[PDB]
Amino acid sequence: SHITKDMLPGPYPKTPEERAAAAKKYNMRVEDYEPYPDDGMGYGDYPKLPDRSQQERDPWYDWDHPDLRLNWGEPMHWDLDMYIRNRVDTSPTPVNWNLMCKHLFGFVAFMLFMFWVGETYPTYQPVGPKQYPYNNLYLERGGDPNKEPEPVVHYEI
Amino acid sequence: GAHLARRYLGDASVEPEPLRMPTFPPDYGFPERKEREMVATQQEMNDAQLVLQQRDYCAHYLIRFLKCKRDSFPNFLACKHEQHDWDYCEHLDYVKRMKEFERERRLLQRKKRREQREA
Amino acid sequence: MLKYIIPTMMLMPLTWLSKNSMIWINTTLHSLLISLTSLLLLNQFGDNSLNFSLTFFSDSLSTPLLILTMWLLPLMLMASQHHLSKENLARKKLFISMLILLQLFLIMTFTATELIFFYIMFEATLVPTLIIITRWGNQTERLNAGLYFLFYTLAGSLPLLVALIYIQNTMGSLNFLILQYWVQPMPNSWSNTFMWLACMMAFMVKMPLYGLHLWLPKAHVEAPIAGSMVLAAILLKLGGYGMMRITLLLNPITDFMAYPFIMLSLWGMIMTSSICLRQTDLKSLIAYSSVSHMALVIVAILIQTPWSYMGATALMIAHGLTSSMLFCLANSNYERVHSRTMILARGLQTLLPLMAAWWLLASLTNLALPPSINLIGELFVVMSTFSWSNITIILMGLNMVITALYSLYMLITTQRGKHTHHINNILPSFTRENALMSLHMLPLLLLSLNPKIILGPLY
Amino acid sequence: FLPSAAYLTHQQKVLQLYKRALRHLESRCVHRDKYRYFACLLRARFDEHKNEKDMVKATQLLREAEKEFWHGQHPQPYIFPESPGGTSYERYECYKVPEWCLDDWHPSEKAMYPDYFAKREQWKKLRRESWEREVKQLQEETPVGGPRTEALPPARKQGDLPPLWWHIVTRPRERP
Amino acid sequence: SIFAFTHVLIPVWIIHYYLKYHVTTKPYTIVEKKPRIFPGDTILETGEVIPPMKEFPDQ
Amino acid sequence: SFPKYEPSRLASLPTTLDPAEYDISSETRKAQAERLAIRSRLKREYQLQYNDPSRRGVVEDPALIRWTCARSANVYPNFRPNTKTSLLGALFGIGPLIFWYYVFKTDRDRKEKLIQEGKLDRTFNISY
Amino acid sequence: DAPPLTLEGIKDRVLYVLKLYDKIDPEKLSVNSHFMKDLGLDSLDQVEIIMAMEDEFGFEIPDIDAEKLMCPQEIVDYIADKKDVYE
Amino acid sequence: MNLFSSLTLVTLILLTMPIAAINFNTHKFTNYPLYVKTTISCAFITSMIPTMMFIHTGQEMIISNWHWLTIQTLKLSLSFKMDFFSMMFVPVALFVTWSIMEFSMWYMHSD
Amino acid sequence: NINENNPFLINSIKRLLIGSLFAGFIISNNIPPMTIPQMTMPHYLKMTALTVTIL
Amino acid sequence: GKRLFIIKPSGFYDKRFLKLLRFYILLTGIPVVIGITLINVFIGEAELAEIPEGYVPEHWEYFKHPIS
Amino acid sequence: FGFSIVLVLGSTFVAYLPDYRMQEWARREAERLVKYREAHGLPLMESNCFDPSKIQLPED
Amino acid sequence: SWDKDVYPEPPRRTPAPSPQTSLPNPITYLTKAFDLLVDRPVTLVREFIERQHAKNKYYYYHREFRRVPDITECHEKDVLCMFEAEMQWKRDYKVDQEIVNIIQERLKACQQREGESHRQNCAKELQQFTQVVKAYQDRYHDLGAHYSARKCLAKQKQRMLAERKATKEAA
């Protein structure tokens, strides 16, 4: 039970007919109806949107759907499945955005730089090796029970 | 300490470096200096399954410590004198390793600077 | 085995000479007696495969799929009422008899002697399902869906016949042991490449692979529940079984010629897991999920490891049960609201509260629940492909992450968070719905106890 | 973007900026008394130029106020644990069955709760009886074909209810 | 106390029944890193004294 | 007293500093009034077809069905193969595929040569 | 987790916190009185009243609703709508 | 020793009874939190003993049974062990979560 | 509604402070030594944690 | 006078399905458990002797469990 | 006839049956084989399952 | 008991405790309480069940098999000859799998008994593990899954031909 005329055959030419049909069918303003345009990317003649819909549409407007942010009258958003709350938080940034990326990249670059500086130049208490008493802990290694008695001893200082 | 500051800011030459520690050969200034007592019974050291990197010097103190800890276990605060003996023996061994470092440091510094000032 | 064949023939006129309000009881009772009869089958032991007749035989790989088919039948006949129950009794008898005839061709398909007989029963597996989905597709493009279906499968499956007649006329008869026990390594000519590509291409269509995948999702979104569950489970895992059977031949050249099929399989597994994360029309999500899992199956088949084969057949059985369940979940929400969209119908945390645990367990089994058969199969597949290549684990783990993500989003989209407060018609949970749920997920976890049946011929 | 009008009455935009600046200074400033000091200083700064009779000077000061506010804002305002985005944001939403339901219960439990179901039946009588003529005639008679508003008129005629009352009155207690 | 009686006396009986007979008729089963023997002690099974460690001094 | 808040594909411009809400045209207020009229009529007929006790089922949204059929069925018409579509198709269909192809042949040839010599870790390599 | 409320008690509490404020007299402070007309406070002080009672009762009211209170009777009514004050 | 393995396995198997006890009841326990609290307290007081036996003795052991998919050259069962970490880490978690059970009795009163 | 007149919560917090003041020393005392404790530190290497936390 | 009317979606169909499910698995679960109990407490598993020479047994009498 | 005659009965039916892929039989055969080979001194599992005396290689 | 000669089990070394305490000894008191509680009814019920075992006599045998000729004695087609040779070789493959299983649990048991002493008293069992897995890796490993018997014969021929030419051109 649905009319084929309530779909959207063909693009925006012509400018009387399709613009009139879009403004009457999508329940929209004439010029706020924004075609993409027809660039061979499919898309029919579907309207362009400002694409935010989440931290815009402030919740004290008290529209219809308390989580989907609808009002039951819209065209729809074309990528509305990518633009629900719990999917992509399209909030305004508290400072900027290139500020964010440049400060975060500079900080992480400095930390990895000093990580390399640490990794090449370590620290230690100044202490010789460990005095494993039996040919540097031999025969508790991989084995060779009589194959190679290896001459290595510790000398007192 | 100042060893690290000197080793990273001045020369790393006269300061010896870890994991390449024995630089001079032995008995250069030992004469007749080795005891290495070690009557800790290698076979019975295998027979008592110590942790690895503990089958070492001062192990007999750990043997007696585990012995009294086992044979009087619910006496919770029993074994402390042998515990301090084992700590003191590892203190002896740690001082001995520091002696090894500083002995190599003094040898390398003094003989290398003497021969490279007048050779 | 003809003792299992002939009562299925006897159940065919049962619906005819059953009276009104008696088709249901006769069909369901006697098909569950066939289910006991099916569970009686596993006499098979050790080294060889057992032979049932002058004609045919059961392999150890045929038996769990025959069990799956004869176990999926009563569940399905129990499933596919109440959306055709307002229509006529004669058409209902037509539909029931068509399903029973379809089952009979499926049993002939799984228990085949020769690959010619497998081909006859292969396109016999095809044809009545299309009559079913075209007569009751219940959506306006069922015509185009069936047209795509039969053209793609008969076009891909056409040179298989000529290649089988060639294997007949150059190597004697086509029965699996004398087809076996006699093979030779056929060298790097072009004829081996074309014959291998023909047989493997026919089954590539049947899985489907990625480059011929759109065959499948239209035939799921524009089919009724019976044809959809039979379609996904029985048809796609039948194609997998057919490739598992036929792949004994032409091993020296498949190393040279089997790289780009692996390539399209892996990269299309990635892209298909990517496509079924964003889409609405929830019915399509199961279809692209099945494309992803059968691409994983195909990677496991063209690597030729016993680990790979056991993991592949476990993944076959597990995803068959999973997709039939999730089809039934979509039909449950479709009986609640006649929408087929995803973002509209929401809520249902309060409403029908114990159905939420079933939706949970369905997203768990598509999520690879960690004692489930699905995870065990995918685990052996990942182990075998990392033994085959020490570098393949990026695409496998990315499939794992995105698979988890779209299964979880499929859970939390329609049954999490808030009632839409305009549905205001739906009834509470029926007996039949959770009955079908208990028929789905109890044998899956009871195989997850003792999976000694559901591994490959080299168990 | 508002229910009643289309514009939003510039004084009200100034008042919105007042409330948001005062809330962000609540979030900025603990100890409540230095906060009271800073709030009175901000209130005095607003009262420095209250009686400007221009409009272009007013909206220029508004633009500069928005710049200084967006520079000197705070990342996490102290939003209440009922506010949107806050701590609760329908925390106990779990028991919000809208009461179009509860008629699909079994009649044993309907015998268990007789008084509420008989009184629900008399509310249903009250819903059905006033529904057709008065409600539909007031919706089709007093508005123009362009409805031009979101508010509905009261049924001031003689008797029964103003329209659309059902979902507005019969919504849950907001704390189960 | 009758709660504790049923709930940690029935499965204790079942697990102690299972963890003798079936678990030891399966031969390659539950196995143990031995408690450590010490050189100054006596063996409870066979019985012989182990030689202790020798002289300690310069502590 | 700020860098004036650059907008971007993530930087959502908040409704405080637009700054197009300063030199408001009277026809833009008329457009806002027309927008109010559209929302008024749509919510009016929603409350008509929503509060009916005689009604039983769903709301039958035409716009959501419009969006779904636009998203699924209205893809293949309309379409023309343009330069951008063909180029982006070759970039997303062939590029990463041939990338993984060459790296798999490369790592496979490394493995093949290293086992052709015999200096592998096949001391025990049982589960192939 | 069950605070009891009553209409007369919350009316007396809102009247009490209005009487706490400075520039209106504690003598002539009605339950049913205007704000801009008779009490001698502007829009700004009225929204300060709004802010303080938001801060005390723990839930805000919006500026789209802050245009239209004008009297304490509707304040008690709207906060009773938020709290649903019956037994 | 039968005691050590048997008591570790009953510290396991005490953590199963409320699941079947709600799944086979249909007339649910009103004192179900009290039930769960006292069986977790029982699990803690049974897990006290093998830890004491461990640090008293050592005796570090593995238990393994019911091998499923013993298919290829490898084989595997349900197999777990008690060494030191898995040995004495259990009663800490049980005692902590028992206290959390008390706090969840109180904290989730009116829901 | 500031109300901690509650037997359950005072039992739980009481028993966890008992387990939070004895059990650290008790558990840390009765372990087998599976490694070598250092026990030999210079000045401002053992004191450094307390120094930094106080500052 | 203080308690509030509690709201639930529905309970009876849920409880009816679960009661029928638990009772109908209970009806032929308990006799099977009792049957296998009486088998492994009375009839035993088997013993483990060897093949006598000059004797051919069945293709059963090789299997440990008696019902197997 | 969905559960009470199919599910638990079939589960007890498949829960014990003879050893699939000759499993315990192979266990006892392996026990006999390794015991025989260690008792007769030869190392267990000599290589070349096909007999190296049973070969006729194409000579170079 | 069982076959404790194909299953190596070394004897145990239990020391004797000696408190040196007056707590006294909670583990001995506790294990005597555990014995006097649990150990007696388990023993009595087991004795009841064992008498019920003693009433009746069941047995089961080892299904022993004969010997096939060969596959190298079969000619090029010889289908019934090949069938016997193939199934006997496949049973050899399965019993060799169980050989590897037994040696793997032998290595597990050696690692678990000796504990922290890794290479002591387990280096020779590890050595024979590496020996038998060297045999297995050389023989049954790298052939694939769609074998019957023939591919192992081909790899056997190729391996001994390569070894023949290698030792002839290196000698």
**Do chain C and chain J touch with ≥3 beta carbon pairs under 8 Å?**
yes
Q: Quick count: other Cβ atoms within 10 Å of Cβ D154?
A: 9
Q: Quick count: other Cβ atoms within 10 Å of Cβ L160?
A: 15
Chain F neighbors of H73, CB-CB under 8 A: 126-127
- Please state, in angstroms and rounded to a whole number, the distance separating the CA atoms of residues D155 and D161: 6
The region, left, alpha or beta by phi > 0 then psi within -120 to 50, assigned to residue C271 is: alpha
Q: Cβ(L110)–Cβ(L121) under 8 Å?
A: yes
CB-based contact, A2 to chain C, within 8 Å: no
Q: Cβ(E32)–Cβ(B49) under 8 Å?
A: no
Q: Cβ(H46)–Cβ(H14) under 8 Å?
A: yes
- Residues 6-45 of chain K whose Cβ lies under 8 A from any Cβ of chain C: 6-7, 10-11, 13-15, 17-18, 20-22
Collapsing DSSP to helix, strand or coil, C46 comes out as coil
User: Which helix (H) or strand (E) segment is C58 a member of?
Assistant: strand C56-58
Q: How many domains does chain G have?
A: 1
Q: How many Å lie between the alpha carbon of L145 and the closest alpha carbon of chain E?
A: 30
Q: Cβ(F42)–Cβ(A27) under 8 Å?
A: yes
Interface mutation vs chain D, best among F40, F45, F55, F58, most D CBs within 10 Å: F40
| Residue of D95, D104, D173 with shortest CB distance to J10 | D104
In a domain, G49, yes or no: yes
Q: How many domains does chain K have?
A: 1
Q: Quick count: other Cβ atoms within 10 Å of Cβ J47?
A: 11
- Please state, in angstroms and rounded to a whole number, the distance separating the CA atoms of residues H16 and H9: 12
Tokens of I22: 């004895």
- What are the phi and psi torsion angles at F115 (to 5°)? -95, -15
> Which amino acid makes up residue C73?
L
Nearest to L142 by CA among E52, D42, F122, C204: F122
| Residue of A11, A39, A44 with shortest CB distance to F70 | A44
Query: What residue has token string 């309309």?
Result: F78
**Do chain F and chain H touch with ≥3 beta carbon pairs under 8 Å?**
yes
Interchain CB distance below 8 Å, D83 and G44: no
Tokens of C411: 């859970």
In a domain, G13, yes or no: yes
Q: Quick count: other Cβ atoms within 10 Å of Cβ F121?
A: 7
With contact defined as 3+ CB pairs under 8 Å, the chains touching D are A, C, F, G, H, J
With contact defined as 3+ CB pairs under 8 Å, the chains touching H are B, C, D, E, F, G, I, J, L
Interchain CB distance below 8 Å, C420 and A65: yes
CB-based contact, H56 to chain B, within 8 Å: yes
User: Which helix (H) or strand (E) segment is H78 a member of?
Assistant: strand H78-82
Interchain CB distance below 8 Å, I19 and H84: no
Question: Taking CA atoms, what residue in F is nearest to D145?
Answer: F41
CB-based contact, F56 to chain C, within 8 Å: yes
- What are the phi and psi torsion angles at C385 (to 5°)? -75, -25
Q: The CATH number of the domain where G18 resides is what?
A: 1.10.1200.10
Interface mutation vs chain I, best among B87, B98, B99, most I CBs within 10 Å: B87
Distance from chain centroid for Cα B55: 14
Q: How many Å lie between the alpha carbon of B60 and the closest alpha carbon of chain A?
A: 13
- The answer to whether residue G42 is catalytic is yes
> Which amino acid makes up residue D85?
G
Chain G neighbors of D3, CB-CB under 8 A: 64
With contact defined as 3+ CB pairs under 8 Å, the chains touching C are A, D, F, H, J, K, L
Q: Cβ(C98)–Cβ(C84) under 8 Å?
A: no
Sign of the dihedral defined by the CA atoms of residues D68, D74, D75, D79, in that order: negative
> Following DSSP, what letter does each residue of B51-64 receive, concatenated?
PTT-SSTTHHHHHH
Q: Quick count: other Cβ atoms within 10 Å of Cβ A72?
A: 21
Give the range of the structural domain holding residue G75, as residue numbers without chain letter: 9-83
Q: Give me the helices (H) in C247-392, please.
A: 254-257, 259-275, 283-302, 306-336, 355-366, 373-388
Catalytic residue of the set G12, G42, G65, G77: G42
CB-based contact, G44 to chain A, within 8 Å: no
- Please state, in angstroms and rounded to a whole number, the distance separating the CA atoms of residues C235 and C65: 11
Tokens of C392: 């393949």
Q: Quick count: other Cβ atoms within 10 Å of Cβ E22?
A: 11
- Please state, in angstroms and rounded to a whole number, the distance separating the CA atoms of residues D116 and A101: 60
Interchain CB distance below 8 Å, J61 and L62: no
| Residue of F3, F15, F43 with shortest CB distance to A71 | F43
CB-based contact, K29 to chain L, within 8 Å: yes
Question: Taking CA atoms, what residue in G is nearest to D13?
Answer: G63
Interface mutation vs chain F, best among A72, A79, A98, most F CBs within 10 Å: A72
Q: Cβ(B33)–Cβ(B100) under 8 Å?
A: no
In a domain, G3, yes or no: no
| Residue of A124, A126, A131 with shortest CB distance to B93 | A131
Chain F neighbors of D69, CB-CB under 8 A: 16
Tokens of E27: 């031969």
The region, left, alpha or beta by phi > 0 then psi within -120 to 50, assigned to residue K20 is: beta
Q: Cβ(G81)–Cβ(G47) under 8 Å?
A: no
Annotate chain F with three-state secondary structure. Answer: CCCCCCCCCCCCCCCCCCCCCCCCCHHHHHHHHHHHHHHHHHHHHHHHCCCCCCCCCCCCCHHHHHHHHHHCCCCCCCCCCCHHHHHHHHHHHCHHHHHHHHHHHHHHHHHHHHHHHCCCCCCCCCCC
Chain K neighbors of C439, CB-CB under 8 A: 2
Q: How many Å lie between the alpha carbon of F112 and the closest alpha carbon of chain L?
A: 13
- Please state, in angstroms and rounded to a whole number, the distance separating the CA atoms of residues C149 and C126: 9
Name every residue whose Cβ is closer than 8 Å to that of residue L116 and which is 6 or more positions away in sequence.
B49, B50, B51, B52, E33
Report the interhelical angle of K23-39 vs L79-114 (nearest 10°): 70
Chain H neighbors of J4, CB-CB under 8 A: none
- Please state, in angstroms and rounded to a whole number, the distance separating the CA atoms of residues L102 and L91: 17
Q: How many Å lie between the alpha carbon of D2 and the closest alpha carbon of chain A?
A: 6
Q: Give me the helices (H) in C11-87, please.
A: 23-39, 62-79
Chain G neighbors of A61, CB-CB under 8 A: 64
Interchain CB distance below 8 Å, E17 and L46: yes
- Please state, in angstroms and rounded to a whole number, the distance separating the CA atoms of residues F28 and F23: 10
CB-based contact, F83 to chain L, within 8 Å: no
| Residue of F71, F104, F128 with shortest CB distance to C387 | F128
Query: What residue has token string 């819909």?
Result: A53
Report the interhelical angle of G72-83 vs G7-19 (nearest 10°): 130
- Please state, in angstroms and rounded to a whole number, the distance separating the CA atoms of residues D96 and A94: 35
The region, left, alpha or beta by phi > 0 then psi within -120 to 50, assigned to residue A58 is: beta
Chain H neighbors of D92, CB-CB under 8 A: 111
- Please state, in angstroms and rounded to a whole number, the distance separating the CA atoms of residues C420 and A64: 9
Interchain CB distance below 8 Å, I12 and H102: yes
- In degrees to the nearest 10, what's the CA dihedral of H65, H70, H75, H77? -20
Interchain CB distance below 8 Å, A60 and D75: no
Question: Taking CA atoms, what residue in A is nearest to L127?
Answer: A143
Collapsing DSSP to helix, strand or coil, C346 comes out as coil
Annotate C199-215 with three-state secondary structure. Answer: HHHHHHHHCCCHHHCCH
Q: Cβ(C69)–Cβ(C249) under 8 Å?
A: no
Question: Taking CA atoms, what residue in C is nearest to F66?
Answer: C341
- Please state, in angstroms and rounded to a whole number, the distance separating the CA atoms of residues C383 and C393: 9
Give the max Cα distance, chain A: 103
CB-based contact, L102 to chain A, within 8 Å: no
- Please state, in angstroms and rounded to a whole number, the distance separating the CA atoms of residues F122 and I23: 50
Collapsing DSSP to helix, strand or coil, E33 comes out as strand
> Which amino acid makes up residue C199?
C
- Is residue H24 packed enough to be buried (19+ CB in 10 Å), middle (13-18) or exposed (0-12)? exposed
Tokens of C223: 């089919």
Q: What was the elucidation method? A: cryo-EM
Quoted resolution (Å): 4.6
CB-based contact, D32 to chain J, within 8 Å: no
Interchain CB distance below 8 Å, J25 and K7: yes
Chain H neighbors of B74, CB-CB under 8 A: 56
In a domain, G59, yes or no: yes
CB-based contact, C354 to chain K, within 8 Å: no
CB-based contact, L59 to chain J, within 8 Å: yes
Collapsing DSSP to helix, strand or coil, L76 comes out as coil
Total residue length of chain B: 119
